[PDB]
Design a protein around this ligand. Structure first.
Ligand code: FFF
Ligand code: MG
Ligand code: MG
Length: 523
């Protein structure tokens, strides 16, 4: 199937004066907001609500300093808000920021038995904040064992009769929690659908939110244009017709990983890699013969233009483009003097390809390995180790030590990869089955444990839950590396959750792309 965008994003001219107009007013709105944070004499509930709203509006990235300092004090000053609402929110914010706040704060809301007091089933704002908090738990938070089921069942019961926009905020939460959703996608929904219709809205913050979102969108649109040009200048739609045309979608993913303007170069470098490996994938999946794929795999491992001759003409195209890309990366990084870090991404790509070849081998033989062995190859084929490594390329502050840490397959990274694999397998199962892919995960899980499809998918679901608790734990201080390098990994897992919601294709991404890159927010 072809791209349904056309050349809609191929050309974008920024309204220079509009940008300056917005940028100038934002600085003023930025200062007003800062003073709202640096403000003195505020209740706990009010301070946490301020932080939460600024974050949901997608503007918190301007007050990384301010918000941190405030949450730090709250952590240290351990409060006693007998309000479920403020407690759950206090818990979530701190946890999301790496503050290992004790889950004992919830015991006051549950009986001797250790279960949530059902007397709270009429505190909708409490249930909602508890619901959101339930997704930020780790393995040491069994006190929150049934917080999801509890808050969920009562919110569903309450929802139909709630006033707007609360009703829509709740209904949306039940379909997509905040912690596991894509930042820009959730920010878009909050600004446009909730806060804008909020009667108690703060006009300074709402205007600040809309202007910023729209200004960043102009930046994103410029980037997607440069990329759409770069992709067009390669012309893989006529030269390599078996490969998918999804550069726009590949950009949405780079955007899910990070949206900040400071990560402009990284995001562009990333989208290029995602698009490139997207071709290599289709090369192993739809086209290419066994004999052909081994030569491709082999050439990638050697990594030298001298190997092109050994490859069929069509694989010569892909292969040459791959080295040029990494050649382009080294040049961009030359200025900063970080040109050397490119090798890390390269070594990961080889790993993906090496495993792509293995995947096809298993397909031909009709091999159905045990889960242990299956995952030993299937994890890298998610490309997440490769994408996460690529993430650091454009991040001007990423050091050799950071790449060093990442190369050891840290648990947070490992968990992100597992979520991707597991979710993908549950969704694409029924499809790949009919294609003769008896090498799929759910198939291996059924043959290994001697269980049905449901049980297998259930076992996989638990693997993703375990994986999320691990990501949440991996964010707690002291973090192995700066949070700056953990977020991309966190975002990769969120993208998976967002793409395979309810485990269909670009039909799921279309609305997000329109709301994020096509339509601007009406002021
Ligand atoms: C599970 C997904 C789609 C999560 C979103 C992020 C992502 C993986 C970005 C990289 C792009 C790729 C997508 C391949 O998608 P698809 O061809 O369906 O995979 P499969 O052939 O292994 O089933 C690549 F081709 F590179 F593998
Ligand atoms: Mg594939
Ligand atoms: Mg799959």
């Amino acid at each position: 199937s072809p791209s349904l965008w056309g050349d809609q994003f191929l050309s974008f001219s920024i309204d220079n004066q509009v940008a300056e107009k917005y940028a100038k007013e934002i600085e003023a709105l930025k200062e007003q907001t800062r003073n709202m944070l640096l403000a003195t004499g505020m209740k706990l509930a009010d301070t946490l609500n301020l932080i939460d709203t600024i974050e949901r509006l997608g503007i918190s990235y301007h007050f990384e300093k301010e918000i941190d300092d405030i949450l730090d004090q709250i952590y240290n000053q351990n409060s006693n808000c007998n309000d479920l609402c403020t407690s759950a929110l206090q818990f979530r914010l701190l946890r999301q920021h790496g503050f290992n706040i004790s889950p004992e704060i919830f015991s006051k809301f549950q009986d001797e038995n250790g279960k949530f007091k059902e007397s709270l089933a009429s505190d909708v704002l409490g249930l909602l904040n508890l619901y959101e908090a339930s997704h930020v738990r780790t393995h040491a938070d069994d006190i929150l064992e049934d917080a999801l089921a509890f808050s969920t069942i009562h919110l569903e019961s309450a929802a139909p009769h709630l006033k707007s926009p609360l009703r829509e905020q709740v209904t949306h939460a039940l379909e997509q929690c905040l912690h596991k959703g894509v930042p820009r996608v959730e920010t878009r929904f909050f600004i446009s659908s909730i806060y804008d219709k909020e009667q108690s809205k703060n006009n300074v913050l709402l205007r600040f939110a809309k202007l910023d979102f729209n200004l960043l969108q102009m930046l994103h649109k410029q980037e997607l244009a440069q990329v759409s040009r770069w992709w067009k200048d390669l012309d893989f739609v006529t030269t390599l017709p078996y490969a998918r045309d999804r550069v726009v979608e590949c950009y949405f993913w780079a955007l899910g990983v990070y949206f900040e303007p400071q990560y402009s170069q990284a995001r562009v470098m990333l989208v290029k890699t995602i698009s490139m490996i997207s071709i290599v994938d289709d090369t192993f999946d739809a086209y290419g013969t066994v004999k052909e794929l081994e030569a491709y795999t082999d050439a990638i491992q050697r990594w030298d233009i001298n190997e092109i001759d050994r490859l069929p003409d069509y694989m010569k195209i892909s292969y040459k483009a791959i080295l040029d890309l990494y050649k382009d990366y080294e040049k961009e990084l030359s200025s900063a003097g970080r040109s050397h870090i490119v090798c890390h991404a390269i070594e990961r790509m080889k790993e993906v390809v090496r495993n792509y070849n293995v995947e096809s081998t298993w397909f031909i033989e009709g091999y159905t390995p045990p889960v242990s062995e299956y995952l030993s190859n299937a994890l890298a084929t998610t490309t997440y180790y490769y994408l996460a490594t690529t993430s650091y390329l454009g991040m001007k502050s990423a050091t050799e030590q950071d790449f060093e840490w990442l190369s050891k397959n840290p648990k947070i990274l490992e968990a992100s990869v597992i979520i991707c694999r597991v979710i993908d397998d549950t969704a694409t199962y029924e499809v790949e089955k009919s294609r003769g892919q008896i090498a799929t995960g759910i198939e291996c899980c059924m043959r290994d444990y001697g269980i049905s499809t449901k049980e297998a998918m259930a076992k996989f679901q638990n693997m993703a839950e375990t994986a999320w608790k691990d990501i949440n734990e991996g964010l707690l201080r002291p973090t192995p590396v700066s949070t700056e390098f953990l977020t991309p990994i966190l975002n990769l897992a969120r993208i998976v959750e967002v793409t395979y919601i309810h485990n269909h294709p670009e039909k799921v991404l279309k609305p997000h792309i329109i709301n994020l890159l096509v339509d601007s927010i009406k002021i």
